[PDB]
Amino acid sequence: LSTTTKYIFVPIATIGCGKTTVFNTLNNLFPQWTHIQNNNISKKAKLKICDLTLLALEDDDQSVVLFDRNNSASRERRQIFTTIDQKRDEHLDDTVDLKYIAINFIPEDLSEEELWDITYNRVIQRGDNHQSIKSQLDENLVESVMKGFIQRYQPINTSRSPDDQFDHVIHLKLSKDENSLKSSLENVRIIIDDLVQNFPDLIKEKPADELINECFQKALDYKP
């Protein structure tokens, strides 16, 4: 009504880390949030993901964008900061404060071998919606595309440009599932607990654990 803060949640990830599952679970819990899926945008689209992000922050209704793209390379993060900063004046007045929250999907201590074993097996066993591999016809192609994102992966580094522009980093886990607890569900809980602590005015009421579980079950059983 006088000073509003908006949030862009930015993954740092590779294919199969669970971005879509985590973000769908969060959107099930918080319907007012906007999940913008790079998978669903034509590469020949007039409005690209950065444009749709700013449009989805214009109304007083709209506070949060889940920016669903890998951003494995540092240049992909730089693109977000520079484009949103250049264009936000077309959409937002000067009373709107924008915060960028990194969602780090790949732990610093994770080897490339473990990253591959977890994510590749997820994708071949359960499928993925990344535009170029959603079909699974040439399995060799799925491998080649996934290897591209890993070859380009540059870990988050908030000590220098561009990642120093993040206002906050949420560090996720990436694990084989253990004790019947899916890694992505653990990460949904990490995000929720982290926001309650660091941005209390965002989550007005923390959801019940059974609601979190149910919203995650819904995301998990979604098979397009």
Ligand X SMILES: Nc1nc2c(ncn2[C@H]2C[C@H](O)[C@@H](COP(=O)(O)OP(=O)(O)O)O2)c(=O)[nH]1
Where on the chain is the footprint of ligand X (CB under 6 A)? 13, 15-21, 122-123, 126-130, 177, 182-184
Bin 16: left if φ > 0, else alpha if -120 < ψ < 50, else beta.
left
Instruction: Using DSSP bridges, classify how beta strands 64-68 and 168-171 pair: parallel, antiparallel or unpaired.
Output: unpaired
Non-local CB neighbours of 50 within 8 Å, separated by 6+ positions? 79, 80, 83, 84, 87
Nearer to ligand X, 200 or 222 (CB): 222
Q: Which two tokens stand for residue 62?
A: 């709209």
Closest approach, Cβ 85 to ligand X, in A, equals 26
Closest approach, Cβ 144 to ligand X, in A, equals 16
For residues 26 and 183, give the distance between their C-alpha atoms in angstroms, rounded to a whole number. 15
Nearer to ligand X, 81 or 149 (CB): 149
Q: Which two tokens stand for residue 11?
A: 């993954």
Closest approach, Cβ 160 to ligand X, in A, equals 26
Closest approach, Cβ 181 to ligand X, in A, equals 8
Nearer to ligand X, 128 or 163 (CB): 128
Nearer to ligand X, 58 or 148 (CB): 148
Nearer to ligand X, 87 or 182 (CB): 182
Instruction: Using DSSP bridges, classify how beta strands 96-104 and 168-171 pair: parallel, antiparallel or unpaired.
Output: parallel
Nearer to ligand X, 6 or 122 (CB): 122
At 79, phi and psi to the nearest 5? -60, -40
Closest approach, Cβ 132 to ligand X, in A, equals 12
H-state helical runs in the chain: 19-29, 49-55, 74-87, 112-126, 139-151, 183-198, 209-220
Closest approach, Cβ 126 to ligand X, in A, equals 3
- Cα 183–16–53 angle (5° rounding)? 100
